[PDB]
Every structure is written in C-alpha cells, then in structure tokens.
Amino acid sequence: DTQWQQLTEHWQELADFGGIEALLGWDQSTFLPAGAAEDRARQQSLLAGLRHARATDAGYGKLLDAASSRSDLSPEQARMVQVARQDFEKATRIPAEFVREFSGHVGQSYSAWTEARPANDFGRMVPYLEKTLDLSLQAASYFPEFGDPLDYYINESDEGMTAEQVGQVFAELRAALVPLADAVIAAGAPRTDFLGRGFAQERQLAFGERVIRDYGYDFRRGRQDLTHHPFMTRLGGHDVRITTRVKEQDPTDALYSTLHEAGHALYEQGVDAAFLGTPLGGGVSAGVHESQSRLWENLVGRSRAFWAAYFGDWRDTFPEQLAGVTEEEMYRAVNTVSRSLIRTDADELTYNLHVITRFELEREMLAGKLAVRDLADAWHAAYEQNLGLRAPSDVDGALQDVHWYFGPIGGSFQGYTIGNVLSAQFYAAAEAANPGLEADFARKDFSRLHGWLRENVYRHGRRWTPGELIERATGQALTAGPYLKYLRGKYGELYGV
Amino acid sequence: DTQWQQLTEHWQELADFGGIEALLGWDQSTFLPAGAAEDRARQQSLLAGLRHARATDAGYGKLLDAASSRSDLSPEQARMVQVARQDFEKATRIPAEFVREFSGHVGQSYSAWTEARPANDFGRMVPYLEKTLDLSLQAASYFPEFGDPLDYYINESDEGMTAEQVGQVFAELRAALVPLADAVIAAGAPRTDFLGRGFAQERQLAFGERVIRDYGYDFRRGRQDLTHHPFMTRLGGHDVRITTRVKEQDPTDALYSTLHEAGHALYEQGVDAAFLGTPLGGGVSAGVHESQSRLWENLVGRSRAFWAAYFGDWRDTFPEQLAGVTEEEMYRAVNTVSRSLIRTDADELTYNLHVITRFELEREMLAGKLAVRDLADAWHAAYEQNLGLRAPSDVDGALQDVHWYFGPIGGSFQGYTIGNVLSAQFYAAAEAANPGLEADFARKDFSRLHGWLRENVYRHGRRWTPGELIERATGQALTAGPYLKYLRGKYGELYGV
Ligand SMILES: [Zn+2]
Ligand SMILES: [Zn+2]
Numbered sequence: 004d005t006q007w008q009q010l011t012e013h014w015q016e017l018a019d020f021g022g023i024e025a026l027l028g029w030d031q032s033t034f035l036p037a038g039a040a041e042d043r044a045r046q047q048s049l050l051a052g053l054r055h056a057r058a059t060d061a062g063y064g065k066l067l068d069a070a071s072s073r074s075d076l077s078p079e080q081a082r083m084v085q086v087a088r089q090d091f092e093k094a095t096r097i098p099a100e101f102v103r104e105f106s107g108h109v110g111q112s113y114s115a116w117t118e119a120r121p122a123n124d125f126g127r128m129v130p131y132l133e134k135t136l137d138l139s140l141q142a143a144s145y146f147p148e149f150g151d152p153l154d155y156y157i158n159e160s161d162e163g164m165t166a167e168q169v170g171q172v173f174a175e176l177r178a179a180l181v182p183l184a185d186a187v188i189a190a191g192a193p194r195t196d197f198l199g200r201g202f203a204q205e206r207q208l209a210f211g212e213r214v215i216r217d218y219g220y221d222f223r224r225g226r227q228d229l230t231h232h233p234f235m236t237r238l239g240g241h242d243v244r245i246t247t248r249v250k251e252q253d254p255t256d257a258l259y260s261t262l263h264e265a266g267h268a269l270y271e272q273g274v275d276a277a278f279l280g281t282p283l284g285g286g287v288s289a290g291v292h293e294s295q296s297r298l299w300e301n302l303v304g305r306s307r308a309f310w311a312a313y314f315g316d317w318r319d320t321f322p323e324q325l326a327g328v329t330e331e332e333m334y335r336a337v338n339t340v341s342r343s344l345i346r347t348d349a350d351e352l353t354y355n356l357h358v359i360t361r362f363e364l365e366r367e368m369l370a371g372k373l374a375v376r377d378l379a380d381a382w383h384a385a386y387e388q389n390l391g392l393r394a395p396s397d398v399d400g401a402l403q404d405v406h407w408y409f410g411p412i413g414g415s416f417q418g419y420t421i422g423n424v425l426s427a428q429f430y431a432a433a434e435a436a437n438p439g440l441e442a443d444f445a446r447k448d449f450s451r452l453h454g455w456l457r458e459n460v461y462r463h464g465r466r467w468t469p470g471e472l473i474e475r476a477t478g479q480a481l482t483a484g485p486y487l488k489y490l491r492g493k494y495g496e497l498y499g500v
Numbered sequence: 501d502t503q504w505q506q507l508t509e510h511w512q513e514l515a516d517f518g519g520i521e522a523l524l525g526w527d528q529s530t531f532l533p534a535g536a537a538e539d540r541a542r543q544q545s546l547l548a549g550l551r552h553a554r555a556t557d558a559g560y561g562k563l564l565d566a567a568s569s570r571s572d573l574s575p576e577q578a579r580m581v582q583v584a585r586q587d588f589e590k591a592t593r594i595p596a597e598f599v600r601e602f603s604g605h606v607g608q609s610y611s612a613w614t615e616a617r618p619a620n621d622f623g624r625m626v627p628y629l630e631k632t633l634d635l636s637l638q639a640a641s642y643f644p645e646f647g648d649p650l651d652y653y654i655n656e657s658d659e660g661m662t663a664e665q666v667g668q669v670f671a672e673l674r675a676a677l678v679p680l681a682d683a684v685i686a687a688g689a690p691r692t693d694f695l696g697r698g699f700a701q702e703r704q705l706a707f708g709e710r711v712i713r714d715y716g717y718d719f720r721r722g723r724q725d726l727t728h729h730p731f732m733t734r735l736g737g738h739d740v741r742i743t744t745r746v747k748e749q750d751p752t753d754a755l756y757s758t759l760h761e762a763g764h765a766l767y768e769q770g771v772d773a774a775f776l777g778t779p780l781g782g783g784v785s786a787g788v789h790e791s792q793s794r795l796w797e798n799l800v801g802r803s804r805a806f807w808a809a810y811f812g813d814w815r816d817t818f819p820e821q822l823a824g825v826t827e828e829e830m831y832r833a834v835n836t837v838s839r840s841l842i843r844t845d846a847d848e849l850t851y852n853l854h855v856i857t858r859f860e861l862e863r864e865m866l867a868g869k870l871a872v873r874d875l876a877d878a879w880h881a882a883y884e885q886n887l888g889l890r891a892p893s894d895v896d897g898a899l900q901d902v903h904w905y906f907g908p909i910g911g912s913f914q915g916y917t918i919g920n921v922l923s924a925q926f927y928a929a930a931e932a933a934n935p936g937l938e939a940d941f942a943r944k945d946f947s948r949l950h951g952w953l954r955e956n957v958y959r960h961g962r963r964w965t966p967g968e969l970i971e972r973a974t975g976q977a978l979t980a981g982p983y984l985k986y987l988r989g990k991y992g993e994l995y996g997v
Pocket of ligand 2: 764
C-alpha cells in the first residue's frame with residue numbers, strides 16, 4: 004500500500020523526465036538558435052541517461068514485482084503494473100552502453116545526412132547506413148523472441164503486428180489502389196490554379212486554428228507554432244503541442260498539416276486523466292496514432308461536408324483568391340491525385356506505394372539480400388516499378404527521408420500505412436454509431452465524432468493492447484475493407500471511375 | 501589529469517542542468533499553456549532536486565579538495581577550483597531540507613501574490629511575508645561569518661559589498677540626485693505627445709532588433725520573444741535569450757526594455773569560450789550585470805549620438821507618427837523625468853529613490869524594528885518621504901514588486917543602483933581608451949565600445965572578483981563620481997539647470 008504510493012511517484016517521475024525531454028526537442032525544432040545545436044544535444048543526452056537510469060532502477064523493479072504478486076488489484080491497476088513491467092523488461096534487455104553507442108552513431112549519421120542530401124552525396128552516407136544496419140541487427144538480437152529481426156521492429160511500432168500481417172495488408176492495398184489511382188490519373192484532374200494566387204501566412208494560420216478548435220483541440224492544454232517539419236509532441240499531462248509549415252504559394256499544405264497534427268493531439272488530449280503520469284497515459288501504437296491524424300485530416304478534413312461548413316469562412320478570408328471558385332471546386336482541389344516523388348506530400352491513393360517501397364527495401368536489407376551500397380539504385384528501381392517515375396538524383400531518392408539516417412533500419416514506415424487503414428476502420432465504426440455525422444460536420448459540430456473517438460479510443464490510452472483496442476472499438480481486427488470501400492467510393496464519385 | 505577530466509565533466513553537467521532549468525523557466529514565461537502550470541512546477545522541482553544533488557555530491561567535493569592542493573594548475577584553473585569550492589561551500593552549508601521548505605514557501609507566496617496584488621489584498625500576503633522574513637533570517641544564520649544578516653544578502657548579490665558601503669553610495673546619490681531631479685521637474689518637460697500617436701507592435705520589434713543587432717547581439721546565439729516582464733536568461737553556452745514587452749500606446753517601453761535586456765545578454769555572450777560550462781562561465785555579480793544593461797540602455801540608448809544615427813530608420817518606420825517632430829525632439833522625449841510610483845519605469849534621476857526605499861525597509865525588517873503587518877503603511881510613508889507621492893492603494897505600494905514574494909527579504913534591490921553607478925564608470929573607461937566613441941555611434945558602429953567591454957569585462961566572467969574586475973577595468977574601485985558627473989552634465993544641458 005505504501006509500496007503503491009511509491010510506484011505512483013516513480014511513474015510520475017518517469018512521465019516528468021519524458022515531458023522535459025519533449026520540451027528539449029520541441030524547443031530544438033522551433034526556437035533553438037542556430038549556434039546552439041551541439042549544447043542542446045548534450046543536454047538531451049544528459050536527460051536521456053538520467054531517465055534511462057530511473058526506467059531501469061533496481062528498486063523500481065522490486066516495487067513492480069511486489070505489486071505484481073498482489074491479488075487485490077483492479078483491472079486497470081494490474082494492467083498498469085503489467086505495462087510498466089513490459090517497459091521495464093525492454094529497457095533492461097539492451098545494455099546501456101549499446102544504447103549510448105547507437106544514439107551517438109545515428110546522431111552523427113543525421114548530421115552527415117543534413118549535408119549529403121542537398122549535396123546528392125549518397126556515397127558518403129553508405130558507411131553510416133552500413134553501421135546503422137549492423138547496429139539495428141544487433142539491437143534486435145537482444146530479443147530472440149523475434150526469429151525475424153524485422154518482426155522486432157514491426158512489433159516495436161505496433162504491438163502484436165508481424166511482417167507477414169504487414170505484407171498481407173500491403174498486398175491488398177497495392178492490388179486495389181494502383182488501378183484506382185491509375186484510373187483517376189487517366190481521367191484528369193480538377194481545377195487547382197486558384198490555390199496558387201497567394202494566401203497570406205497569418206491568415207492561413209488563423210483559419211487553421213478556428214477549424215481545429217471546432218474539432219476539439221484544447222488550447223488551454225497546448226499551442227501551435229511554425230516549424231520546417233510538422234509534428235506533435237507531449238510536454239506534460241496538459242501540454243500537447245503541434246507545429247505546422249506554411250507556404251503562401253499553396254494553402255492546402257499548412258491547412259492539412261495542421262489538421263493532421265491536431266488529430267494526433269486530440270488522441271493525446273483524450274487520454275483519461277486517471278492515466279496521466281502512469282504507464283498507461285499515452286497513445287498505444289504508431290498505427291493507432293496515425294489513424295487519428297489521418298481521420299481528422301482525410302476522412303473529415305477532405306470531405307464534402309467539411310467544405311460545406313468552412314468554404315464560407317475560407318472565401319471571406321481569401322476573397323480575391325476564391326473569386327470564380329465554387330465550394331464544390333475547393334472540395335475537388337483538395338482531393339487531387341498524381342504520381343509524385345515525396346512521400347509526405349503524396350495523395351490519398353498513391354501514398355501507400357511510398358511506404359511499401361521503403362518497407363520492402365528494409366526487408367531486403369535486414370535479410371542480407373540487398374547491400375546498403377546498392378540502396379540508391381534499388382530505390383530508383385522500386386520507385387519506377389511502384390510509382391512509374393524516378394527522381395533525377397538521390398536527393399529525392401534514397402536520401403529523401405530521414406528515418407534510416409536518424410534511427411534504425413527496419414519497421415520505420417509501416418505505421419504510416421497501418422494508420423491510413425485504421426483511420427477508415429475507426430471512422431466507419433464511429434458513423435455506424437452516429438449515422439448523422441455528415442450533417443453535424445456541415446454545422447461545424449464534431450462533438451459526436453470526437454465523443455465516440457474519446458470513449459472508444461482515446462481515454463483507454465495503453466490500458467488495452469492495439470488489437471484489443473481495435474476489436475473492442477470496431478468489432479473486428481485490422482482490416483483494409485473499410486479503407487478500400489471509402490477510397491473507391493470517394494474517388495469513384497469524384498472522377499467517374 | 502584523470503581527476504581533472506572528471507571535474508570538467510561534472511562542471512559541464514552542472515552547466516547543462518542549469519541550461520535545462522532555464523529552458524523550463526523560459527518556456528514557462530513565454531509559451532506554457534494555461535492548464536500546464538502545475539505539471540511544469542513539478543518538472544522544475546524535479547530538476548532542482550537533481551541539480552542540487554550534483555552540486556553537493558561528496559565525490560565531487562573530494563575531487564575539488566584534491567585539485568585545490570595541486571600546485572601545477574594555471575591561475576585560471578586554480579581560480580575555477582576556488583570558485584567551484586566556494587559554490588560547493590555555500591551549496592552544502594544550507595541543509596537540503598531547508599532549501600526545499602524555503603523553495604516551496606516562496607512558490608506558494610508567489611502564487612498567492614499573483615492574485616493578491618490586482619485585488620489590493622495586502623492583508624492576505626502578511627502571513628506569507630512573515631514566514632518569508634523568518635526563513636530569510638534563518639537562511640542567513642547558516643552563514644555566521646556575516647554578523648549582520650543583511651550583509652549576507654548584500655554579499656550574495658555583490659561579492660565583497662557591505663551594508664556600510666551601500667549606505668554611503670545611497671547618501672551620495674540622494675544628496676546629488678534629489679536637487680537635480682527637483683530642478684528638472686521644476687523646469688518643465690519636453691514635448692512628448694507624438695509618442696502617443698500609435699506605433700504598430702510588429703514595427704517596434706523589428707526596429708529594436710536592428711538596434712541591438714548593431715550593438716553586437718548575436719542572433720545565432722540567442723533570440724527575443726514577448727512576455728509580461730522583460731528578462732534575460734541563459735539556456736546554454738550559445739543560447740542567451742531576451743524578452744521584451746510592447747505597448748502600441750508608447751514605443752519607448754519596448755525599445756528600452758529591449759536595449760536593457762540586450763545589454764544583459766551582451767555581457768553573457770561575451771564570456772570567454774574557455775569558461776563556458778565551467779564555474780567561471782557567467783556574470784560576476786548583480787551590480788556588474790546591471791551595469792551592462794544600463795550602459796547599453798541609458799548611456800548609449802538615450803544619448804544624442806544614438807538618435808542622430810537611428811532617427812532616420814525610426815522616422816521611416818513611423819512616418820506619420822514623427823511628422824512635425826525633429827530628431828532633437830525625439831532625443832529629449834526619451835529623457836523626461838518625474839516623481840512616479842513604479843520602480844521599473846522610473847527615469848534616470850529618480851530611479852534610485854525607489855531602491856533606497858526598499859533597502860531601508862529591508863533593513864528595518866531584518867533588524868526586527870519594522871513588523872511585517874506594518875509594511876504596507878511604512879512603504880507608503882517612505883514613498884511620500886522619498887518621492888513626494890503615494891500610491892492610491894497597495895497594488896502599486898508594497899505589493900508592487902515581486903522580489904519579497906518570490907524570494908528572500910533583504911538585499912533584493914541595491915544591485916539595481918550599483919548597476920546604475922557602475923554603468924557610467926565602465927563607460928567612461930571605455931571612452932578614455934577609445935577617444936571618439938560618440939562619433940562611432942552616429943555611424944551605427946559600436947565595435948569599439950563593445951570590443952572594450954568584451955575585453956575588459958565580459959570575457960572574464962567570474963575569473964576576477966567584482967572588486968578586482970572593476971579595479972582592473974577602470975583603474976579604481978566603485979565610485980559614484982563618473983555616474984554623478986554624467987547625469988549632471990546630461991540633464992544640466994537638457995533642462996538648463
Ligand atoms: Zn502523423
Ligand atoms: Zn536588469
């Protein structure tokens with residue numbers, strides 16, 4: 004009983020270390036002055052070392068063992084203890100010296116990448132990728148329960164997911180989305196030139212903050228700022244911050260980045276107050292998290308009802324830019340499709356082809372079938388086959404994404420595609436329970452959609468495993484069905500295909 | 501050599517905790533959302549505890565003892581050890597229990613004050629101040645080498661400074677500045693109404709950043725943001741941040757807050773790189789620090805040469821506002837004088853009367869001659885006596901300043917006046933070594949003044965004691981001479997007195 008109070012305080016201390024670490028990273032991406040990079044990284048390592056010591060503290064381990072042997076715990080408290088013991092298990096499996104070696108290597112890899120990408124110097128990154136691949140395999144070998152080292156990373160991203168389950172889902176998406184995208188591309192695109200007329204940055208941000216405020220984003224428990232790369236980060240139990248990036252030459256970039264990151268933040272902001280500061284107080288997996296950003300961005304933000312509700316405010320804010328443009332035309336311009344090179348900018352239909360490419364290259368590298376020095380060539384070859392075009396150099400080829408340069412190789416991307424699928428699966432379950440969602444959206448009323456997602460997804464945090472969470476909320480395990488039905492219906496209707 | 505590497509690593513770890521603690525506080529004042537106050541305070545408390553442990557670690561103390569007995573250390577390394585041991589002495593002198601009790605109390609006092617001041621509820625703060633006074637005396641009692649507890653606080657602010665030395669400075673400033681201020685007030689004020697014509701906030705910030713940029717503020721090692729109260733804070737060896745406050749109804753506020761805090765930041769940004777991350781890597785005392793904010797704010801920022809250089813940019817930025825206003829009128833308008841209530845806004849001539857008021861009330865309270873419950877009345881009586889008027893309530897009376905509600909009572913304010921004195925003493929030494937500084941200023945060239953201050957003041961950090969630094973840099977100990985000569989000359993010529 005006194006042991007439980009001590010466990011509660013140690014858990015709150017781990018959450019507090021995490022919030023402070025998140026602040027160091029949030030400030031690094033937003034306001035850190037250019038000449039202060041090195042000291043900030045050292046500050047981050049200092050905190051990483053301290054937090055790891057507490058996450059692996061032997062006394063804490065004994066407290067967990069004590070609470071675990073009790074028989075009088077509520078379902079939530081026992082699950083809280085179980086999750087803590089699972090985190091403790093993972094944290095102590097890997098020697099702290101290996102953790103530090105890996106962190107220093109990928110940190111140096113990153114710095115080399117920030118220069119080699121603009122310089123089209125993939126040959127320079129090869130030694131960095133070779134060591135990263137070796138370290139990635141070594142890290143997975145501390146977990147022999149995954150015979151396939153790729154399964155260790157897939158599981159780290161989405162508890163319980165396997166490479167065979169991922170490959171199956173990918174196979175289904177490719178078989179369905181390639182024809183649907185090709186048919187949309189062959190039909191021709193809606194008008195888009197009015198999006199290039201000049202949209203003032205401050206006006207874009209104000210519009211975005213009105214929308215996500217309607218969604219339910221709580222500005223007493225967060226804020227938004229500008230960054231080069233949008234992200235969401237939690238600095239505390241009541242401090243969930245988002246960032247966006249604005250292009251005056253295209254207002255859909257900032258709007259949908261903001262809706263996307265806001266979706267992540269709604270998830271975090273809906274976690275039950277009783278779980279904040281405990282091992283259950285956070286999102287449960289990468290795919291479930293990305294299902295919420297994608298739900299508010301795509302399923303809601305790009306829908307006809309969304310623009311039925313906001314076109315008026317939009318045209319008022321941008322009167323000259325929307326002159327001669329109908330509400331229907333703005334709805335179509337937000338749902339264009341094309342074969343493109345940059346994954347983060349890819350449309351709803353071709354996006355997953357980027358993830359599959361990266362996933363299959365990871366499979367090839369981790370299995371020893373593809374040497375890293377051949378990665379640049381294999382990447383272009385996969386882009387030609389999967390997207391029908393190739394980048395002019397390696398800048399937007401294998402150097403495009405930071406993941407393999409600032410972290411392990413393997414399991415880096417499937418969460419994006421799992422999130423896309425689950426977005427429609429969670430959304431369909433929400434509409435099954437609230438058939439008048441679209442009529443609400445037209446009134447700028449998202450309370451029932453938010454209410455359903457909070458009751459069935461957000462509040463539970465980590466109390467359920469991803470698979471339990473998905474099955475309880477939607478009645479079935481991960482399935483591509485609702486996702487494909489939504490896309491075929493939406494784009495079949497948009498392009499007459 | 502092995503032992504020295506450990507000292508430098510521990511010293512850098514102390515500096516890194518300091519930067520992180522500063523980041524938590526900087527973010528708290530700028531961007532922390534409203535619902536995140538409680539969690540941030542616990543985070544700060546967690547970091548305060550860890551840093552305090554590091555600062556008092558017995559092993560660390562043993563390393564310092566070893567290194568102090570060595571005979572092969574350079575004068576700087578020996579001084580680092582001496583400074584580290586002096587910090588180690590005071591940090592361990594006060595029991596950790598007492599550190600937490602005092603810290604927790606002033607936290608509750610501060611929070612109650614943020615509500616009691618706007619409500620004119622001094623009676624509510626009386627118990628908080630009584631406990632603060634008792635704890636202030638108790639804290640000083642851990643340092644019996646100061647017979648007078650006020651001398652403990654005076655020395656904590658400015659090493660080597662005493663109450664008897666402060667009193668002599670006050671008497672001299674009072675004897676010279678009261679008649680000069682009364683004569684200025686009786687002569688009449690320059691035109692000022694054009695300052696009320698409306699100055700857009702964004703232009704004010706842009707202008708202010710161009711000025712301090714020319715001063716020498718390095719935005720690659722800092723930045724500026726908006727807060728309720730301007731301040732300067734060091735988040736790292738290359739991260740010295742400043743904040744300002746903008747009033748569109750009066751542009752002198754933002755401008756001179758920015759010049760003031762930039763002056764603080766210039767000092768920190770000039771500390772020698774060899775001292776960053778060591779016990780010598782920071783400003784040496786409150787008085788020396790405020791000497792630099794006041795030098796760049798008053799001696800430079802309010803001088804005729806400053807406006808000969810910047811009125812053009814000023815007029816171009818605010819053309820209608822400065823229509824019918826000469827460059828000479830803008831110079832006179834930034835140098836008005838009057839008996840006022842708010843210490844932080846008080847002019848060059850009457851400012852010190854606010855510091856003297858507070859110091860003498862501290863003296864009476866520390867000696868047990870003034871009861872805390874009588875402070876509100878004694879404050880008003882001292883304001884009538886020293887400044888010729890009194891506030892309508894306690895809001896701008898004894899509740900005005902945060903110092904006694906978020907920290908100890910005693911020695912809280914004399915550093916501001918010490919800084920005023922030293923600003924002219926340092927400045928005159930700079931002109932003696934660089935004949936013709938004012939001519940440089942008209943060209944927006946501050947490199948000779950800044951270079952002199954960096955070489956003779958900033959780079960040393962804590963390498964010299966305050967008395968040694970002032971003596972070496974200016975050829976004499978602290979003296980009000982240069983200060984009184986500067987004011988008598990400046991205001992004698994402005995007002996014909
Ligand atoms: Zn996302
Ligand atoms: Zn100051």
